[PDB]
Amino acid sequence: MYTFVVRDENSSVYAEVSRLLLATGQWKRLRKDNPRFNLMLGERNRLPFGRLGHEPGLVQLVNYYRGADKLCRKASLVKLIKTSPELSESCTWFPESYVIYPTDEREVFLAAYNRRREGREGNVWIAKSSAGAKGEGILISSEASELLDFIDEQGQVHVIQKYLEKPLLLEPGHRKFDIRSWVLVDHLYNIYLYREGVLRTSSEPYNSANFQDKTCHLTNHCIQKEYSKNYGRYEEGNEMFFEEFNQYLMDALNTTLENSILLQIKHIIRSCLMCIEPAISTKHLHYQSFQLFGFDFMVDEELKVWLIEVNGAPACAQKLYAELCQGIVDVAISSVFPLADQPTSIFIKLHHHHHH
Amino acid sequence: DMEVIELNKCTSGQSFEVILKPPSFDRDPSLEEIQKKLEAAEERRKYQEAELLKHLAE
Amino acid sequence: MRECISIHVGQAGVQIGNACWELYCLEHGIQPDGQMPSDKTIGGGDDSFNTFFSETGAGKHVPRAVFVDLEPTVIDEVRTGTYRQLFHPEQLITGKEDAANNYARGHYTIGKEIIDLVLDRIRKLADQCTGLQGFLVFHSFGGGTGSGFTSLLMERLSVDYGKKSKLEFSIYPAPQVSTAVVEPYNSILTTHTTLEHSDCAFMVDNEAIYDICRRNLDIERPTYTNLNRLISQIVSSITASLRFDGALNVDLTEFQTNLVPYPRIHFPLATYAPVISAEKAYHEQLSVAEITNACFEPANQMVKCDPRHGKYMACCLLYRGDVVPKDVNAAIATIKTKRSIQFVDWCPTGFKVGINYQPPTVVPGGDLAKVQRAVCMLSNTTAIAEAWARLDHKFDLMYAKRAFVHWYVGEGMEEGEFSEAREDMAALEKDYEEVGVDS
Amino acid sequence: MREIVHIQAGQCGNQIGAKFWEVISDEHGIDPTGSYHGDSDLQLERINVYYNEATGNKYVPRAILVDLEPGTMDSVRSGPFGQIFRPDNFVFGQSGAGNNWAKGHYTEGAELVDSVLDVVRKESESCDCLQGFQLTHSLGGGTGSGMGTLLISKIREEYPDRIMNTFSVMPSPKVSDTVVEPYNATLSVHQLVENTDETYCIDNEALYDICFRTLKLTTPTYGDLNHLVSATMSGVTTCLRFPGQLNADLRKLAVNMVPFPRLHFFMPGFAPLTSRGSQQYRALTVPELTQQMFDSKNMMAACDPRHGRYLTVAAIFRGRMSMKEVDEQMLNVQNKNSSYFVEWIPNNVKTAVCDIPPRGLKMSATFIGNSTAIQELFKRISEQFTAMFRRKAFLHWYTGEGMDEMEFTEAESNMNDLVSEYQQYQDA
Ligand SMILES: Nc1nc2c(ncn2[C@@H]2O[C@H](COP(=O)(O)OP(=O)(O)OP(=O)(O)O)[C@@H](O)[C@H]2O)c(=O)[nH]1
Ligand SMILES: Nc1ncnc2c1ncn2[C@@H]1O[C@H](COP(=O)(O)OP(=O)(O)CP(=O)(O)O)[C@@H](O)[C@H]1O
Ligand SMILES: Nc1nc2c(ncn2[C@@H]2O[C@H](COP(=O)(O)OP(=O)(O)O)[C@@H](O)[C@H]2O)c(=O)[nH]1
Ligand SMILES: COc1ccc2c(c1)NC(=O)CN2c1nc(Cl)nc2ncccc12
Ligand SMILES: [Ca+2]
Ligand SMILES: [Ca+2]
Ligand SMILES: [Ca+2]
Ligand SMILES: [Cl-]
Ligand SMILES: [Mg+2]
Ligand SMILES: [Mg+2]
Ligand SMILES: [Mg+2]
Ligand SMILES: [Mg+2]
Hints:
The structure is cut from a larger assembly and holds chains A, B, C and D.
Chain A: E1 2-6, H1 12-22, E2 27-29, E3 39-41, E4 61-62, H2 69-72, H3 74-83, E5 97-100, H4 106-117, E6 125-128, E7 139-141, H5 144-153, E8 158-162, E9 177-185, E10 191-194, E11 198-201, H6 221-227, E12 239-240, H7 242-253, H8 257-280, E13 288-289, E14 291-299, E15 305-311, H9 321-333, E16 347-349
Parallel strand pairs in A: 1-2, 1-3, 3-4, 4-13
Antiparallel strand pairs in A: 5-8, 6-7, 6-8, 9-10, 9-11, 9-14, 10-16, 11-12, 14-15
Chain B: E1 3-9, E2 13-21, H1 31-57
Antiparallel strand pairs in B: 1-2
Chain D: E1 3-9, H1 10-27, E2 51-53, E3 59-61, E4 63-67, H2 71-78, E5 90-92, H3 101-105, H4 108-125, E6 130-138, H5 143-158, E7 163-170, H6 181-195, E8 198-203, H7 204-214, H8 222-241, H9 250-257, E9 265-271, H10 286-293, E10 310-319, H11 323-336, E11 349-354, E12 363-371, H12 375-389, H13 396-399, H14 405-427
Parallel strand pairs in D: 1-4, 1-6, 4-5, 6-7, 7-8, 8-9, 10-11
Antiparallel strand pairs in D: 2-3, 9-12, 10-12
Helix pairs in contact in D: 1-2, 1-5, 1-8, 4-5, 5-6, 6-12, 6-14, 7-8, 10-11, 12-14
The structure holds guanosine-5'-triphosphate (GTP), phosphomethylphosphonic acid adenylate ester, guanosine-5'-diphosphate (GDP), ligand J7S, calcium ion (3 copies), chloride ion (CL) and 1 more.
The site of guanosine-5'-triphosphate has 27 residues of chain C, from helix 1, helix 4 and helix 7.
Keywords (chain D): Acetylation, Cytoplasm, Cytoskeleton, GTP-binding, Isopeptide bond, Magnesium, Metal-binding, Methylation, Microtubule, Neurogenesis, Nucleotide-binding, Phosphoprotein, Ubl conjugation
Binding site for Mg(2+) (chain D): 69
GO molecular function, one term (chain D): GTPase activity
């Protein structure tokens, strides 16, 4: 009998992993604060990583990588990409971004803004805090005079980032989307991309000039269900899955999902996680980590993928819970703690070793 | 970029300092107070012991 | 030349002291009787080894050592063992009944009745010193004597020798070899009361040494003898600079200058490599790069913790054997590209390096193989606060129900001392948080 | 901390006490004349804990034998190891106590208690460092119960900084001499709660059930019951008597086992369970020892440990075996049954090992548990007590010796408080 503890009651994913583990009959759940666990499904804040791996006679595993928040806070994601030589200042798949406080980059942000003031070509940006995420605290603007004043009107740290003026638009609709990819990093630092992603679709035709239509410009699920009158028209829940998006790309643009988009996604995922591997790996450590991430991508008119955000505590889409959570158990949990006694994996392994 | 500094050698060994980057930015109580704490604790012991011996006398 | 007095308190302190003096004698070519043939100044001298050994008219080399235990059985093995001749009877001080794993019993009850004797025996050695420099105190956190008596002793040493430096070697409690459930209480009580009296303290977690002995020495169930011989190798690395010629860490004050910029944050992490089994038939000797790289693996640390998730205030590399600066600098350059070595913004990112050409000496018949080069890294990293967080959480669990508290109150200690001591540790954990972490 | 002074009081006290000295004398190589004819040097390195050394290098138990009747002590002189004991340590009256606590504690026993204390003092004065005392007695009679607790009170007055330890045999209607046992036991429990540091609860109910259900003895005698007691007593004193990595004493045992001063009643266990003249041909494996020692069927107190939580546990493995395998098994028990160990005392199970096994066994394990399920023992006695006390039945045997009903009411209350107190830490 293996043992686990549950310290995040609000996690839909790990609620289902808890159910699946109990239902095997070889995993018992203990109380939150019983230290004699094999598996910790941990809290989001102040997870006490320093107490893990000091219980003799127990291999201990946790569902978070200590240090993975360098990837998963917007401000720190930008610092990571700018300062790491693996992902240069010239990194071609991240939008040009600058960190800004009420350390700071305001005068270097304006120095690239003045190339656009002497430019005839595109000055729309976006401003965001790393976790003011209720659908709010997002300003689009053609100039900094509205941004810098708006950033000080809110309390916390913010990032100013290029707004992708010409995104790819699904027809019928002339409408926006982002892509959510679920990536599981195991204890051996295998990077596993889940084969099913999902497009979080806008249901309102795109653009005006007076941007303020958090519905056509912002594709968050909460924003579509409240402000969008057209929520649920083309696909239910404003969620287009891969079979349909592949089919559209074949019919409308004569390419596949794989070629036009997924290669770039796999490249980005792999480059991000291999960058931070030396800082977070648990390879020779006294406890072990796995983690599920949610990578969020934009696609432009040119079929170029851009990385928007990395979520360290993602929710799944409702159809997919069953399959993804069963995959977390097989790959991330039963790999360390094996059960007793034709498989095709739901993940694609990201490895690539080119010689030069 | 590694500057090697204050190299000192001798027959049994050598020592030195290596800098890779410069700095990025810029009540002991008396004998009496100790005695008046050990003695205080001893009084609490004697008190507890006398209380026990009062109880046993009852 | 400035002398250092070593003080070994409780079972842990005494047995580790034995191991260290055994080792020191083998390193300096001093026999069990105390004779040192290679010493040609008979009857005295101001050589570097005389920091740790005094000399008699008959050419006997006598440790500047005091052994203190509240029960006699462990020090009786010193009195009757291989190095019985080495020590003078007045150096070996014993009571009749121990502290029963109770800090309050070691500090208040039994401590009060022997403290004036021990200071008098310490004063006898201090009177033989031309320039007393200070003290090295060896003890457990978990024992009643190790914790209780040591904290009292340290308070007094500050009164009687206020200008002298005091260093600790402290064994941090591990359940896998501990005999007591109240070690978290004891550990926190002694840390609270000792903190202002110690200039620099090297913690050794018995968990780390136990597991090093498992993985690297192929020992199924490590005894204290196994643990202590490994610890003494490390203690020897740390002290080599005081007993040998050199220009790094030549005096107790320098440990503080080099490792402790913030006085309360005075717990450097030791990491040691290589640890290689004597029974291993074919061993490929490890290079400067491989052993220096080994100093950044948690599996080789004296406390299991993760330096990648904290910040450094200082780092010292102490090499023994076949090492030259060129190899060290080439190793360090390679290591800085591959690993996460973040210093605090108000210190230089750098390493003070000390090399002694004599390779490590091993005890004949022991578990450690001879090696051509070894290193001990001393780094003051905020990651060591993980150990404090583990210990404090255990303390919080027990103290929330007042479990075992009556045993301490019954020795004359007040309940408030628990919360006062625990508050100091909350402040200590927060100090480490401030220094080592960003929002 | 070396010398322990042993006291045995009453019929039960002296029968188990005699068997204890028989068993450990054989384990330490000592014969009925007190001459050492052993081979190992471990059998003498801490022989002074229980024995005084006399002229001719004879070993003499630091043992005082007390009773109000001469009968059982004359049987002890006649018994196999009867000549070992110091003759001056036989302290006995003539009246007997008639299974009456009041006679033992207030009338007949007061008359004899001072002469017992003289012998205690004589033994204590000779001690280089006295740890404290161990008493064997029943709680259901009059002498062991009533006088034994009077003695405990007096000894605490004169040696208030020494450890008091008891092996206290609890009465049961399955092995019952008289109906007043629940009265004598309840009156004794009050005393033990105030005046002992650690008490081994040896439940005659459990010893019977083990003899009947497990050892297949249809008609258990006191000898069958005492075979279980003497094996348990040997076991629990192992680390006091033998050198190992844990050289324990009565205080360290107390400090580490007792988190709250009143909750000092332990549940002992033993594995493998044997009957006298056993066919133990198959030595147990370390997993078997470990599984059995924690089994409720191996508990010497008739309580279900799954009805409470372990505050602390001490475990003694005896024989030649893998210390690694012992650690693994001991860790497996805790990790696989973790709800039954209070989380608010971290690492509350400690284990010792001794190379020398008891007689007749290659391997054995002894369990010492401080569990909150011991309240079951105390509730049982309390229910038996109340059934009689609500009608004042049989009280005249006690009022005749000067006792008042109020003293019964206080004893009932204190024992029910003890039960509530265990219950307080079972829920937490
Ligand atoms: N590394 C090491 N640890 C030890 C040794 N002896 C004891 N310990 C540890 O020290 C703690 C117990 O404290 P001790 O030093 O034995 O106790 P003491 O200072 O003698 O105090 P009392 O016996 O309580 O008077 C436990 O965590 C042990 O594992 C030793 O020789 N080496
Ligand atoms: N640089 C950019 N250019 C154009 N549109 C962008 C953009 N960055 C974000 N968006 C839009 O805003 C949305 C995401 O905003 P944000 O990155 O703050 O997510 P969020 O933290 O509010 C919820 P979640 O963490 O689940 O993604 C996307 O759906 C996308 O349509
Ligand atoms: N286990 C055990 N119990 C006994 C023995 N002798 C008596 N008893 C129990 O002890 C109680 C009677 O007390 P006893 O010791 O005979 O009275 P005392 O001589 O006045 O102390 C009853 O509960 C008996 O069941 C014995 O040899 N072994
Ligand atoms: C936390 O549990 C304990 C429980 C018991 C102890 C200790 C910690 N630590 C000791 O010094 C004394 N002691 C023990 N004392 C004796 Cl007498 N026997 C033992 N047998 C087997 C095991 C521990 C034993
Ligand atoms: Ca000389
Ligand atoms: Ca000072
Ligand atoms: Ca009379
Ligand atoms: Cl001074
Ligand atoms: Mg977010
Ligand atoms: Mg997003
Ligand atoms: Mg000790
Ligand atoms: Mg009888």
